[PDB]
């Protein structure tokens, strides 16, 4: 998933965009993946209960 960014893989995001600019997309991807992982952990906790 792109998670609102221009690309899904961050390896080319760090290779095509400058560090001052790619930080927004990297933080967007990090926030999206952290939210997905937290939702997964909440669902796993409900399943474990």
């Amino acid at each position: 998933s792109k998670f609102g960014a221009i690309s899904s893989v961050l390896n080319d995001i760090f290779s095509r965009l400058d560090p001052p600019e790619a930080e927004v997309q990297i933080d967007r991807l990090i926030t999206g993946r952290l939210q997905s992982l937290q939702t997964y952990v909440t669902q796993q906790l409900i399943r474990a209960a």
């Binding site: 899904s8 893989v9 390896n11 080319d12 290779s15």
Partner: protein, 48 residues
């Protein structure tokens, strides 16, 4: 090959191990991608 080395093949940057391939690719294909945008295979732009 057969060693953990940083590969840069036609702009594709990353870290992985290059091994001997046993799969047969079609003559028009150039990339093999796994589930969730996982680059599993690649062809050499020099020796094909």
């Amino acid at each position: 090959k057969n060693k953990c080395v940083n590969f840069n093949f036609n702009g594709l940057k990353g870290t992985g191990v290059l091994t001997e391939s046993n799969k047969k690719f079609l003559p028009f294909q150039q990339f093999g991608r796994d589930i969730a945008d996982t680059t599993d295979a690649v062809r050499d732009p020099q020796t094909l």
